[PDB]
Design a protein around this motif. Structure first.
Motif, PDB file in Angstrom:
ATOM      1  N   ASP A  43      47.121  45.018  41.441  1.00 54.73           N
ATOM      2  CA  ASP A  43      45.956  45.529  42.148  1.00 54.73           C
ATOM      3  C   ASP A  43      44.691  44.866  41.621  1.00 54.73           C
ATOM      4  O   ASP A  43      44.462  44.814  40.409  1.00 54.73           O
ATOM      5  CB  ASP A  43      45.869  47.046  41.994  1.00 54.73           C
ATOM      6  CG  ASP A  43      47.033  47.764  42.641  1.00 54.73           C
ATOM      7  OD1 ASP A  43      47.980  47.079  43.085  1.00 54.73           O
ATOM      8  OD2 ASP A  43      47.005  49.010  42.703  1.00 54.73           O
ATOM      9  N   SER A  44      43.871  44.357  42.542  1.00 52.68           N
ATOM     10  CA  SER A  44      42.619  43.672  42.217  1.00 52.68           C
ATOM     11  C   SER A  44      42.847  42.428  41.359  1.00 52.68           C
ATOM     12  O   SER A  44      41.976  42.033  40.581  1.00 52.68           O
ATOM     13  CB  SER A  44      41.629  44.618  41.534  1.00 52.68           C
ATOM     14  OG  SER A  44      41.710  45.917  42.088  1.00 52.68           O
ATOM     15  N   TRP A  45      44.006  41.794  41.499  1.00 53.58           N
ATOM     16  CA  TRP A  45      44.295  40.545  40.808  1.00 53.58           C
ATOM     17  C   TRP A  45      43.929  39.372  41.707  1.00 53.58           C
ATOM     18  O   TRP A  45      44.384  39.297  42.853  1.00 53.58           O
ATOM     19  CB  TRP A  45      45.768  40.468  40.412  1.00 53.58           C
ATOM     20  CG  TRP A  45      46.058  39.508  39.293  1.00 53.58           C
ATOM     21  CD1 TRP A  45      46.772  38.350  39.375  1.00 53.58           C
ATOM     22  CD2 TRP A  45      45.645  39.626  37.927  1.00 53.58           C
ATOM     23  NE1 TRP A  45      46.827  37.737  38.149  1.00 53.58           N
ATOM     24  CE2 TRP A  45      46.143  38.502  37.243  1.00 53.58           C
ATOM     25  CE3 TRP A  45      44.904  40.573  37.216  1.00 53.58           C
ATOM     26  CZ2 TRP A  45      45.924  38.299  35.885  1.00 53.58           C
ATOM     27  CZ3 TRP A  45      44.686  40.369  35.870  1.00 53.58           C
ATOM     28  CH2 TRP A  45      45.193  39.240  35.218  1.00 53.58           C
ATOM     29  N   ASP A  46      43.113  38.462  41.185  1.00 53.48           N
ATOM     30  CA  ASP A  46      42.645  37.310  41.944  1.00 53.48           C
ATOM     31  C   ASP A  46      42.552  36.113  41.005  1.00 53.48           C
ATOM     32  O   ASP A  46      43.062  36.143  39.882  1.00 53.48           O
ATOM     33  CB  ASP A  46      41.307  37.621  42.628  1.00 53.48           C
ATOM     34  CG  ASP A  46      40.386  38.454  41.760  1.00 53.48           C
ATOM     35  OD1 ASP A  46      40.833  39.497  41.245  1.00 53.48           O
ATOM     36  OD2 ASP A  46      39.212  38.066  41.592  1.00 53.48           O
ATOM     37  N   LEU A  47      41.903  35.044  41.476  1.00 56.63           N
ATOM     38  CA  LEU A  47      41.773  33.826  40.684  1.00 56.63           C
ATOM     39  C   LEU A  47      40.762  33.953  39.556  1.00 56.63           C
ATOM     40  O   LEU A  47      40.871  33.225  38.565  1.00 56.63           O
ATOM     41  CB  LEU A  47      41.393  32.644  41.575  1.00 56.63           C
ATOM     42  CG  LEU A  47      42.535  31.685  41.910  1.00 56.63           C
ATOM     43  CD1 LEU A  47      41.993  30.360  42.415  1.00 56.63           C
ATOM     44  CD2 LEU A  47      43.430  31.473  40.705  1.00 56.63           C
ATOM     45  N   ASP A  48      39.774  34.843  39.685  1.00 58.30           N
ATOM     46  CA  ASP A  48      38.859  35.081  38.573  1.00 58.30           C
ATOM     47  C   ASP A  48      39.598  35.651  37.371  1.00 58.30           C
ATOM     48  O   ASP A  48      39.329  35.269  36.226  1.00 58.30           O
ATOM     49  CB  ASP A  48      37.734  36.017  39.009  1.00 58.30           C
ATOM     50  CG  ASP A  48      36.734  35.338  39.918  1.00 58.30           C
ATOM     51  OD1 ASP A  48      36.789  34.097  40.041  1.00 58.30           O
ATOM     52  OD2 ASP A  48      35.892  36.044  40.511  1.00 58.30           O
ATOM     53  N   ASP A  49      40.534  36.573  37.611  1.00 55.79           N
ATOM     54  CA  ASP A  49      41.363  37.091  36.529  1.00 55.79           C
ATOM     55  C   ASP A  49      42.228  35.994  35.924  1.00 55.79           C
ATOM     56  O   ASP A  49      42.370  35.908  34.700  1.00 55.79           O
ATOM     57  CB  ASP A  49      42.240  38.228  37.044  1.00 55.79           C
ATOM     58  CG  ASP A  49      41.435  39.371  37.619  1.00 55.79           C
ATOM     59  OD1 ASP A  49      40.466  39.805  36.970  1.00 55.79           O
ATOM     60  OD2 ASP A  49      41.773  39.843  38.721  1.00 55.79           O
ATOM     61  N   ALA A  50      42.814  35.145  36.770  1.00 58.80           N
ATOM     62  CA  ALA A  50      43.707  34.104  36.276  1.00 58.80           C
ATOM     63  C   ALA A  50      42.959  33.080  35.433  1.00 58.80           C
ATOM     64  O   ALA A  50      43.534  32.481  34.517  1.00 58.80           O
ATOM     65  CB  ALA A  50      44.410  33.421  37.446  1.00 58.80           C
ATOM     66  N   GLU A  90      43.970  47.253  37.860  1.00 58.33           N
ATOM     67  CA  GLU A  90      42.673  47.008  38.490  1.00 58.33           C
ATOM     68  C   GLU A  90      41.744  46.229  37.556  1.00 58.33           C
ATOM     69  O   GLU A  90      40.681  46.700  37.150  1.00 58.33           O
ATOM     70  CB  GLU A  90      42.027  48.320  38.946  1.00 58.33           C
ATOM     71  CG  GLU A  90      42.471  48.781  40.321  1.00 58.33           C
ATOM     72  CD  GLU A  90      42.386  50.283  40.485  1.00 58.33           C
ATOM     73  OE1 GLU A  90      42.513  51.003  39.472  1.00 58.33           O
ATOM     74  OE2 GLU A  90      42.191  50.745  41.628  1.00 58.33           O
ATOM     75  N   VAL A  91      42.171  45.017  37.223  1.00 60.33           N
ATOM     76  CA  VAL A  91      41.389  44.135  36.364  1.00 60.33           C
ATOM     77  C   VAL A  91      40.294  43.482  37.195  1.00 60.33           C
ATOM     78  O   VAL A  91      40.545  42.987  38.300  1.00 60.33           O
ATOM     79  CB  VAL A  91      42.291  43.084  35.700  1.00 60.33           C
ATOM     80  CG1 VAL A  91      41.462  42.110  34.885  1.00 60.33           C
ATOM     81  CG2 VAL A  91      43.325  43.760  34.822  1.00 60.33           C
ATOM     82  N   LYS A  92      39.073  43.479  36.667  1.00 64.66           N
ATOM     83  CA  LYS A  92      37.892  43.011  37.383  1.00 64.66           C
ATOM     84  C   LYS A  92      37.173  41.935  36.579  1.00 64.66           C
ATOM     85  O   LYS A  92      35.959  41.980  36.372  1.00 64.66           O
ATOM     86  CB  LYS A  92      36.961  44.179  37.693  1.00 64.66           C
ATOM     87  CG  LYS A  92      37.635  45.315  38.444  1.00 64.66           C
ATOM     88  CD  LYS A  92      36.620  46.282  39.022  1.00 64.66           C
ATOM     89  CE  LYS A  92      37.006  46.709  40.432  1.00 64.66           C
ATOM     90  NZ  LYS A  92      38.401  46.324  40.777  1.00 64.66           N
TER      91      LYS A  92
HETATM   92 CA   LIG Z   1      39.940  41.128  39.854  1.00 62.31          CA
END
Ligand SMILES: [Ca+2]
Ligand SMILES: *[C@@H]1O[C@H](CO)[C@@H](O)[C@H](O)[C@H]1NC(C)=O
Ligand SMILES: [Ca+2]
Ligand SMILES: [Ca+2]
Ligand SMILES: [Ca+2]
Ligand SMILES: [Ca+2]
Lengths: 145, 145, 121
Positions: free
Chosen positions: C47-54, C86-88
């Protein structure tokens, strides 16, 4: 079908998760004719529930410059995943009352002349709407195609 | 739903096995969570959970693997009271058995006393039995033993 | 306990392993994101995982920049307790501990929704 929503877009559901990993070609008649793992065989949770938005889905609203939804504005009909206006011809007091009761504003209403500004000049969808006595929604009123 | 720890050197650690009425079986790393391990240590009176070790840390079981997933909230007193979500088979192999280390690892016994209540205090550490020391041995400790 | 002068040879120097690692990947810079906290190895929910997290994970691991951020456990299912949800991450934080999220708490996420990344070798 216009959309296929997931991840509990329309809310979390209560009850067993009967189907999972559904694979269909789109030419089938019933949902159980699709290839699925089995009746009740799933590894899913209730926060991932499937939903659809079909072509013959309609919503109604009154749009003004100040607010998208209000008790006064332009009458817009959302059909086929698109918004559009309603013709003014053959409007009656029964028809205007149905819109106001359907939206939750009041029991009656009146049609004012056109305002100073129009937004996006969306195309006209339906016309010649005639509302009988008894309906409380605009979808049950006879009209032109 | 009866739990058991098998294969550990210290008193309160080993492989996690749960009996479904009359049959013992292992659990997957994925199915077991932190809330379930909290109940398992509490039910077995082994204290609080220190670690959850996967990948057959204490060996591989030889038998059936339970596919159900526990959904404990953490405050249950037994694993029987925990809601359980069923899952299909084929999830894991026996190289993915789960293990748990709870906090009460101490091994103490009383020897050379005719009455089981009285005797000499002994402690097991690093694989051997030995005798304690008189210093810092008060009556508060003796009350707990 | 006894206090004595000691040669530098007798002193103990220790290097500890990294908190964050990637598992089940053919490339050393690709795999499932796992973190260590409170005595157990755990995973992250998609949840809320995207390329900014990666980007933050690929920077913290010391790999190259991130280009894909998988979800729904592409690289395999994980083990242990799920620690983050939910990492932001804003894309510039030095560690996954800096970014705001649900910390060391009960996550409704399952083990089929584990997040994965793929960094340049
Ligand atoms: Ca995120
Ligand atoms: C439905 O799909 C349309 C067309 O791509 C899109 O504009 C709209 O945001 C979608 N709505 C939902 C609720 O997913
Ligand atoms: Ca499909
Ligand atoms: Ca599935
Ligand atoms: Ca004492
Ligand atoms: Ca998810």
């Amino acid at each position: 079908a216009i959309n296929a929503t997931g991840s509990a877009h329309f809310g979390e559901g209560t009850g067993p998760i009967w189907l999972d990993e559904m694979k269909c070609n789109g030419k089938e008649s019933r949902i159980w004719q699709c290839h699925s793992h089995g009746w009740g065989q799933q590894n899913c949770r209730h926060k991932e529930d499937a939903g659809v938005i079909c072509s013959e889905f309609m919503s109604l609203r009154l749009t003004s410059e100040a607010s998208r939804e209000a008790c006064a504005g332009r009458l817009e009909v959302f059909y086929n995943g698109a918004w559009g206006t309603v013709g003014k011809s053959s409007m009656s007091e029964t028809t205007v009352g149905v819109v106001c009761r359907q939206l939750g504003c009041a029991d009656k209403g009146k049609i004012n002349p056109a305002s100073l500004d129009k937004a996006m000049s969306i195309p006209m969808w339906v016309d010649n709407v005639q509302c009988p006595k008894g309906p409380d929604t605009l979808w049950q009123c006879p009209s032109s195609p | 739903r009866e739990p058991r720890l098998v294969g550990g050197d210290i008193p309160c650690s080993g492989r996690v096995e749960v009996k479904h009425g009359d049959t013992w079986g292992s659990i997957c790393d994925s199915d077991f969570s932190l809330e379930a391990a909290s109940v398992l240590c509490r039910e077995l009176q082994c204290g609080t959970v220190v670690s959850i070790l996967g990948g057959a840390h204490f060996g591989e079981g030889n038998g059936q693997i339970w596919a159900e997933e526990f959904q404990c909230e953490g405050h249950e007193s037994h694993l029987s009271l925990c809601p359980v979500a069923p899952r299909p088979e084929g999830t894991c192999s026996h190289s993915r058995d789960v293990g748990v280390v709870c906090s009460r690892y101490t091994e103490i016994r009383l020897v050379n006393g005719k009455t089981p209540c009285e005797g000499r205090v002994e402690l097991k550490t690093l694989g051997a039995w030995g005798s304690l020391c008189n210093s810092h041995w008060d009556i508060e400790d003796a009350h707990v033993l | 306990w006894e206090k004595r002068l000691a040669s530098p040879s007798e002193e103990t120097w220790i290097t500890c392993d990294n908190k964050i690692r990637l598992q089940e990947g053919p490339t050393s810079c690709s795999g499932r994101v796992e973190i260590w906290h409170g005595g157990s190895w755990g995973t992250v929910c998609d949840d809320s995982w995207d390329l900014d997290d990666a980007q933050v994970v690929c920077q913290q691991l010391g790999c190259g920049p991130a280009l894909k951020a998988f979800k729904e456990a592409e690289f395999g299912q994980g083990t242990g307790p799920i620690w983050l949800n939910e990492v932001k991450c804003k894309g510039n934080e030095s560690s996954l501990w800096d970014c705001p999220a649900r910390r060391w708490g009960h996550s409704e996420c399952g083990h089929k929704e584990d997040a994965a990344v793929n960094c340049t070798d």
